[PDB]
């Protein structure tokens, strides 16, 4: 029964080890979006403002 319980512990530990790979996939997706914010911040740094010639009213 103790041997049966130990195999159940091993099976749950392998399930948590499969969860680790999904957590690492979260890290890659967070890092990819961080670059996307960074390149958008560069383009808002390079904005030129246009002023019209005559006021409307």
């Amino acid at each position: 029964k103790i041997h049966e319980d130990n195999q159940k512990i091993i099976s749950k530990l392998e399930s948590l080890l499969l969860l680790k790979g999904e957590v690492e996939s979260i890290k890659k997706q967070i890092n990819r979006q961080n670059i996307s914010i960074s390149t958008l911040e560069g383009h808002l740094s390079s904005i030129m403002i246009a002023i019209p010639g005559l006021g409307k009213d």
Partner: protein, 1253 residues
Amino acid sequence: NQILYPEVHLDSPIVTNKIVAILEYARVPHAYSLEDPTLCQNIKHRLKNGFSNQMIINNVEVGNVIKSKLRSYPAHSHIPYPNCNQDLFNIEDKESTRKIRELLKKGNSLYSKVSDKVFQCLRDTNSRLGLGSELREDIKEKVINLGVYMHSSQWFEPFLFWFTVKTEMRSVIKSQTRRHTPVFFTGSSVELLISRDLVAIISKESQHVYYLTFELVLMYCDVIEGRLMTETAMTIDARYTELLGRVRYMWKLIDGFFPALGNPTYQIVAMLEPLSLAYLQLRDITVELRGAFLNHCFTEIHDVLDQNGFSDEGTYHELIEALDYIFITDDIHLTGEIFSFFRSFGHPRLEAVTAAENVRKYMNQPKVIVYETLMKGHAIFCGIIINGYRDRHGGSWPPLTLPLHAADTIRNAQASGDGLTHEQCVDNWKSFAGVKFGCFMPLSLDSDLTMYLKDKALAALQREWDSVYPKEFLRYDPPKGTGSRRLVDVFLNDSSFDPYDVIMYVVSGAYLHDPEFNLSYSLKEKEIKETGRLFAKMTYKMRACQVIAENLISNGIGKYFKDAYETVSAFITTDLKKYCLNWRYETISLFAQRLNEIYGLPSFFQWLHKRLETSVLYVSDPHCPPDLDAHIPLYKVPNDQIFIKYPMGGIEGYCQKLWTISTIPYLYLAAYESGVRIASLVQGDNQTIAVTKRVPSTWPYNLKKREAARVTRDYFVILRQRLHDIGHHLKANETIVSSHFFVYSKGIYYDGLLVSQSLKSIARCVFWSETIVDETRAACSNIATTMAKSIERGYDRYLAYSLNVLKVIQQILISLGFTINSTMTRDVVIPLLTNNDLLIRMALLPAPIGGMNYLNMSRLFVRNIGDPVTSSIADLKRMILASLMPEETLHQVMTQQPGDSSFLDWASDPYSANLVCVQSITRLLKNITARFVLIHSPNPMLKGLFHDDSKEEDEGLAAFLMDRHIIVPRAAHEILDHSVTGARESIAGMLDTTKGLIRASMRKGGLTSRVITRLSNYDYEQFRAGMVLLTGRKRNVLIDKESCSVQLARALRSHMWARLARGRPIYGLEVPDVLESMRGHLIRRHETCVICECGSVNYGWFFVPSGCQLDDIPSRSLRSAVRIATVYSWAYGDDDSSWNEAWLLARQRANVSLEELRVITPTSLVRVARYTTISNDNLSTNFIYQQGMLLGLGVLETLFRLEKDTGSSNTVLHLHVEHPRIPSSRKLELRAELCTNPLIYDNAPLIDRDATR
């Protein structure tokens, strides 16, 4: 009114449409052509309808006289205003100018009597100081024959004609204010008609006809009189020999260009001001900086000649050769004298459509700016504010909120309290992207009143904007105007004024929805530019918000913005005139938000652009009418003619400090990118940037200037790029980069030398002065001031004194014989004109002792003389010893009839000698009008400052201070200046009444008829008092000849003040004269005569080496209370009884006790002066020694004036020098309740621990 005279000098623009309107009402044919024919339609419409008034009927008869005279001349041709200038600069008629010729010939006779003795007195004065060996021979012939040189000039015969026409026209204006028809006066070559509004001149030989208004006559008189005085001054003085010929050729060349070119000649005249700077830039050491700005000037001159039809290659080359002859000279000091001849040609005629289309072009331009450069400048702006608040508050950071993404450098600097450099601000500009300052600048508005009293014209309402144009020039009847015209009239008559109410009028947003807001333009009075310049007028509340906004910027944040190796600098001069048109809301918005966060006012500093973007602007001149059939509101008006419909920009002025403090961060950004150091100086529309780089000391002078020029050029390119990124468009061709010179207020600075315009003040030395009544004394004081200013800028001293005497004699003769005053009775004119010696003795006697000469011989050498009475008596003794004036005149000075003046008049003017009828009458009229309008003002800011019984309190204070056993008049002046009396006098003095408030007080009746009759006749009283003085025969036996001037001045002050003083002594007003005390000796070689002969060892030592080239290289009220306590404790003694009176006087300004009050209360000389070593060791009275050093510098300037270098010997110069307690007899009347007005009274003692300030 009988107290207002027509204006002597021109303070108004020249408008073509006025001349066209007069000549079309008079139906006279004319040769003018208008860019807008709108007036030329409207008049016709009125003449189609039959509209007429008194001015139309009066002008028909004048035109009929002109047509009846022009029937006699068949081939007559009218010439317009510019094209006739060469004729009207040279016009003479012998028959019409007889009386002024006889008057000036009599002046030549009197000056020919006294000129030799004037020369002898000046020669003795020169020989006392040791310069007698170096006196030039030509100076004698120039002094004796000065009137002959004045009368031999080519502008004398023009000046007599134009002075006659001006004076006769002024007689017509005042007399008409019988129906006599003006008739022509047939001269030798000129036929003349003078009316109130029109002067018709017909030349009999050429059959040329000229029509002129009053403004043109005033302009021609000023121009010809300035040319006459300037040519006389250059002919007499020997240093201006080549400049005389060059400016004569300039006059001939431009006067030749006037008939063919016309009004575009003034563009060349305005181009004469860049050209001196370009020709001075040609002599630079550096490589390509020589002909940079001359190329732009020559290209624009070629464009001016090409656009007007003179497209010939021969003409331009001859103009270049002529300009090369005029502007090339060897002396640097004579290069900048061409700036003085800038106004010698006249002023252009103007029209509103051209200025309107120029502002329309500039304010309706699209732009694209860059966000990054704007945020970098914003980061530098924040860094400057942070460093200022750290410097004034002990290194503490101001209240601000850094964002989450702030850099670690900025956060650690905020935590550790460390300042920020510019590099950290520019590199980490994203750390200031979302900062929000706290409120740390107070709004002090109830403590200042100095600004609203300044007069500023107010525009009309928006519902009634056509009221400025008369019914005569309009096709429709305009609405009658109800708005007030001036700022001070609304401000004083305001029943409820709150300084925070107009700020709420901005913040609440009522200015965008105000039905009565209006801005208008008006043409400038004196601009050489043909397009001209404009000044704006707006309504009451918006102008008040503008004044409060500029005060808030000036008193707060803007004070933050004020500032084996050597250092070299090079200069950039730029113009800032058109920057205001370039500012927009997007560029100024972030800076205005930061100022809103600092000052705690929501949307306040953004007011100008938001108001201007929704409003229609127009240029207003009465003679230029809108092209409208009926009355139409401004928003329906088309975008043509004088109207600018929806502007994007800033008005000239009105936000200048904000634009300046926004502009400086971009200069620092260009400095950081170029790696240079900047010192920045801002003049009026001129900016000088000094670029500094560190250089080795071992390098020669040639390479260091090349290095400074290289880094300055690189900085200039980077600065042009960064100013273009925000949209200013610096336009590099107009700016100038130099390695030596920069321009500022005094003159040109050239490598430690000052190049000054000495001949401008001589051109400003004219007859009469800008006063509402013609006074002789103010005119003579103006002559003395202009001659003294010319002496300080480098003119010769003795020649200026002789010209001053000649101009005083001529001014007295014009004031007696050729005047429009009807109060000049025959009881004073005939005795003065028949007796020559009486008039000469009146002209030569100094004014502190009763004469009409306002220039002293000590004043020619030093700026400050101590006692005017003692200096005047010393000058009179010099004139007696030189036989210029008789001895008995001195006795007359000591037997003069005393005048009537109280203790208050003595305390206001401590050096006065109680003379009869000396005070300027315009000042008296302004003081009475200002006092009346400030007492009778319902303004709640003036609740208790001005009372009806103020004058009795002021006289009681003066009689309390100066009726003690010893009279000290200088200390009482200092006490009254810092008391409530001087506070009221300072508030009344800053209000300029001008003509308008004097007329308004005349309609109110504050000026009584006795006041008008008495103030109308004071010139006759001055001449009567002078005649009674000089004809009296009373002698005093205590007057010894060649006695001390100090004892004579004490006896004079005791005699004139004997009613008030009653024999008590007077202390603290006597000082020895500068010229009498000091005797000079020059040691070229072999010892001193004075030291060996007299044994005197009290002297100052001056040394000039040989072989040097001179030509080339708390609250204010608390401080007032402290000053009152200090002067009263010092002058009247200190004990227990005297400190109580000092506490009672000082309590009225600040809220302090007795113990707290005890605890808290405790030039042209530089040409020699760079080489001069002054040692004061052999001296043994600080004022006498300081004026001695100034006299020594003046003597060494006079010695080397005409010589280029010191020659072969060292120059050595020697200038030898030859109360327990006062108890109070009166008792203090004081005031029953202390005034609690915030301008004057300080409610809190504030910092009692700090005894400084």
